[PDB]
Amino acid sequence: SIISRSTFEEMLKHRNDAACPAKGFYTYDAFISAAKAFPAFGTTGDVDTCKREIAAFFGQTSHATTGGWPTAPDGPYAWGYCYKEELNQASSYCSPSPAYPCAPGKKYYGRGPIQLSWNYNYGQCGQALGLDLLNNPDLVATDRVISFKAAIWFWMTPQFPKPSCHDVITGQWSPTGHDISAGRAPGYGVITNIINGGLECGRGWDARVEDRIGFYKRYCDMFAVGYGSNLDCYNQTPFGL
Ligand SMILES: [Cl-]
């Protein structure tokens, strides 16, 4: 009960349009089942903080899967969850390691709501959930429940030097001096940085960053809560340089 059926359907009300390749795949019942694997997701903090965690998770995943455009019906921030796999599937996304070795003939391109990528992410996730995602990465795009479990797993897991998205949005992250001079003050912008900052943050205005913010504001307005501070990353140095 971290979110109701009718709220879920209104948030994602164009995902089953004829133009959307993932039509029929994303369901309320499968999201609720995946959430049970991570009981602290959506239940941490006061009432306003729980609402902001739900709006931020669906804001970032909506951008990663959007089919919107500026004159779309009900505006561009009603078109999340239209896709479920990366458009260009040429690359294998292999970064060789003894810990998580790349399986022969397999490819670790983006799948599901968070567009999970690279062998080390499929590997760590599969270990945590007791699933064989390193040998069978397609499961993140073919099984309705596992697709959501992989996205929530990423949201909840720190990867040094990055904190978890969960910790940042619930107020459990405390920035160091190094973070402060890089412009990384706590808020929605730092979450964009964790997810894809190497390509999107610190260079000035960027259309992808604006689109992430638009979805988050719409969902916050639906729940009647304020946005918080520091929403963009136009002036933040990326993690890991
Ligand atoms: Cl948890």
Judgement on whether residues 154 and 216 belong to the same structural domain of the protein:
yes
Say if CB 152 and CB 38 are below 8 A apart. Answer: yes
Q: Are residues 50 and 159 part of one domain?
A: yes
Judge if 106 and 33 occupy the same domain.
no
Q: Assess whether 118 and 59 both reside in one domain.
A: no
Tell how far the Cα of 120 is from the centroid of ligand 1, in angstroms: 21
Whether residue 117 sits in one domain with residue 151:
no
The answer on 179 and 70 residing in a single domain is: yes
Residues forming a β-bridge with 159: 162
How many domains does the chain fold into? 2
State which approach was used to obtain the coordinates: X-ray
- Do both 71 and 151 map to the same domain? yes
Going by C-alpha positions, the residue among 66, 87, 88, 71 that lies closest to residue 17 is: 66
Q: How far apart are CA 158 and CA 4, in angstroms?
A: 28
Distance 113 CA to ligand 1 centre (A): 19
Q: Are residues 77 and 152 in the same domain?
A: yes
Indicate whether 67 and 113 sit together in one domain.
Answer: no
Whole-number Å distance between alpha carbons of 223 and 202: 30
Ligand 1 center from residue 162 Cα (angstroms):
18
Same domain, 1 and 80: yes
Residues 153 and 199 in one domain: yes
* Nearest in space to 147 (alpha carbons), one of 8, 25, 44, 3: 25
Span from the CA of 202 to the centroid of ligand 1 (angstroms): 31
Instruction: In whole angstroms, give the CA distance from residue 101 to residue 96.
Output: 6
Domain final position from 104, 122, 142? 142
Closest CA to 157 of 145, 169, 146, 167: 167
Residue 32: closest CA among 5, 6, 7, 65: 5
Q: What is the DSSP letter of 32?
A: H
Structural domain ending residue among the three candidates 127, 142, 157: 142
Q: Which CATH number does the domain housing residue 102 bear?
A: 3.30.20.10
From residue 104, how far is each of 81, 88, 90, 135 by CA, in Å?
30, 20, 15, 9
Cα 219–chain centre separation = 15
Here the CATH number for the domain that contains residue 36 is 1.10.530.10
Identify the residue whose tokens are 């306003």.
48
Q: Quickly tell me which residue has 């205005």 as its tokens.
A: 205
Alpha carbon distance 177, 173 (integer Å):
13
Residues 181 and 104 in one domain: no
- Cα 45 to averaged position of ligand 1 atoms, centre (Å): 13
Distance 182 CA to ligand 1 centre (A): 30
Write the DSSP string, 60-127: HHHHHT----TT-TT-GGG--S---B-S----------SSSPPPTT-----BTTTTB-SHHHHHHHHH
Resolution (A): 1.9
108 is in which domain, residue-wise?
85-142
Neighbouring C-beta atoms of residue 205, cutoff 10 Å: 8
